[PDB]
């Protein structure tokens, strides 16, 4: 990804599986 | 992705499977 | 990834499996 | 990755498996 | 990785398995 | 691919070129 | 692909070229 | 790939070239 | 790959070139 | 690879070139 | 791409972003 | 890419970002 | 890439970022 | 890459970052 | 890489960073 601004102001969960970035 | 501004102001869950970005 | 600004202001979990970055 | 600014202001967990960076 | 600024302001756990950086 | 049950009961040939799975 | 049940009961040939799955 | 059950009951050939899994 | 059950009951050949798993 | 159960019950050949696992 | 014969006889510029070939 | 014959007879610039070939 | 014949007859610049070949 | 014939007949610059070949 | 024939007939610069060949 690029220039991602992930600011949930709360619970944050990121679950990925076999990605190709 | 590009220039993503993810600001839910609350619970944030991201679940991905075998992506190709 | 590039220029990621991950600031949830809370619980942060990152789970990855066999990625290719 | 590059230029990652991981500042959750809270609990931070990073779990990776067989990555290729 | 490069230029990683990991400042959670809290509990920090990093678990990796057979990476290729 | 996921949950592939390849049971031809005979000759089986799989030829792939530069895939992105 | 998902939940593929390939059971030809005979000769099976699969030829692919530069796929994106 | 995941949960692949490759049981041809016969000749099995798998030929791959520059994959990205 | 994960959970691969390769049981051809016969001749088994696997040929790979410059993979990225 | 993980949890690979390679039981061909016969001739088994594995040929790899410059992999990145 | 395959069998590309790029012969502009002049200035040639190719700019790509996050492709999936 | 395959069988690319890039012969511009002049200035040649190739700029790519996070490709998946 | 395969069988690339890059013959610009002039200035040649190749710039890549985090590729997956 | 394979069988690359890079013959620019001039200035040649190759710049790569975190590749996976 | 394999069978690379890098013959620019001029200035040649190769700059790489954290590759995985
Ligand atoms: C943007 C992004 C998030 C998680 C994993 C990847 C490969 C990319
Ligand atoms: C934008 C994005 C989110 C999660 C995963 C990917 C590959 C991309
Ligand atoms: C952006 C990113 C997060 C976690 C793992 C990878 C390979 C990339
Ligand atoms: C950005 C990143 C996080 C954890 C592991 C890797 C290989 C990369
Ligand atoms: C960025 C990074 C974190 C942990 C392990 C590796 C190889 C890389
Ligand atoms: C399902 C599958 C078969 C062969 C190659 C790939 C990448 C995927
Ligand atoms: C379902 C399937 C068969 C062969 C190749 C791919 C990428 C997918
Ligand atoms: C499912 C699979 C078979 C052969 C090669 C790859 C990368 C994946
Ligand atoms: C599933 C698999 C078979 C052969 C080679 C690789 C990298 C993966
Ligand atoms: C699953 C596997 C078989 C042969 C070589 C590699 C790197 C992986
Ligand atoms: C044909 C082609 C040109 C540039 C980039 C890609 C992925 C493909
Ligand atoms: C054909 C091609 C040109 C530049 C980069 C890639 C991955 C492919
Ligand atoms: C064909 C090619 C040019 C530059 C970089 C890669 C990974 C591939
Ligand atoms: C074809 C090629 C050029 C530069 C770097 C890589 C990994 C591959
Ligand atoms: C083909 C090639 C050029 C420079 C560095 C690597 C790892 C590969």
Curated annotation (Swiss-Prot), chains A, B, C, D, E, F, G, H, I, J, K, L, M, N, O:
Changing residue 8 to S: In FTD1 and CBD; reduction in the ability to promote microtubule assembly. There is a cross-link at residues 5, 18 (Glycyl lysine isopeptide (Lys-Gly) (interchain with G-Cter in ubiquitin)). It is found in: Cytoplasm, Cytosol; Cell membrane; Cytoplasm, Cytoskeleton; Cell projection, Axon. Expressed in neurons. Isoform PNS-tau is expressed in the peripheral nervous system while the others are expressed in the central nervous system. The modification N6-acetyllysine is found at residues 5, 18. The modification Phosphoserine is found at residue 12. The modification N6,N6-dimethyllysine is found at residue 18. The record marks 5, 18 as: Not glycated. Phosphorylation at serine and threonine residues in S-P or T-P motifs by proline-directed protein kinases (PDPK1, CDK1, CDK5, GSK3, MAPK) (only 2-3 sites per protein in interphase, seven-fold increase in mitosis, and in the form associated with paired helical filaments (PHF-tau)), and at serine residues in K-X-G-S motifs by MAP/microtubule affinity-regulating kinase (MARK1, MARK2, MARK3 or MARK4), causing detachment from microtubules, and their disassembly. Phosphorylation decreases with age. Polyubiquitinated. Requires functional TRAF6 and may provoke SQSTM1-dependent degradation by the proteasome. PHF-tau can be modified by three different forms of polyubiquitination. 'Lys-48'-linked polyubiquitination is the major form, 'Lys-6'-linked and 'Lys-11'-linked polyubiquitination also occur. Promotes microtubule assembly and stability, and might be involved in the establishment and maintenance of neuronal polarity. The C-terminus binds axonal microtubules while the N-terminus binds neural plasma membrane components, suggesting that tau functions as a linker protein between both. Axonal polarity is predetermined by TAU/MAPT localization (in the neuronal cell) in the domain of the cell body defined by the centrosome. The short isoforms allow plasticity of the cytoskeleton whereas the longer isoforms may preferentially play a role in its stabilization. Interacts with MARK1, MARK2, MARK3 and MARK4. Interacts with PSMC2 through SQSTM1. Interacts with SQSTM1 when polyubiquitinated. Interacts with FKBP4. Binds to CSNK1D. Interacts with SGK1. Interacts with PIN1. Interacts with LRRK2. Interacts with LRP1, leading to endocytosis; this interaction is reduced in the presence of LRPAP1/RAP. The tau/MAP repeat binds to tubulin. Type I isoforms contain 3 repeats while type II isoforms contain 4 repeats. It is linked to In Alzheimer disease, the neuronal cytoskeleton in the brain is progressively disrupted and replaced by tangles of paired helical filaments (PHF) and straight filaments, mainly composed of hyperphosphorylated forms of TAU (PHF-TAU or AD P-TAU). O-GlcNAcylation is greatly reduced in Alzheimer disease brain cerebral cortex leading to an increase in TAU/MAPT phosphorylations. This is Microtubule-associated protein tau. It comes from Homo sapiens (Human). The gene is MAPT.
């Amino acid at each position: 990804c690029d220039n991602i601004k992930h600011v949930p102001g709360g619970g944050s969960v990121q679950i990925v599986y076999k990605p190709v970035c």
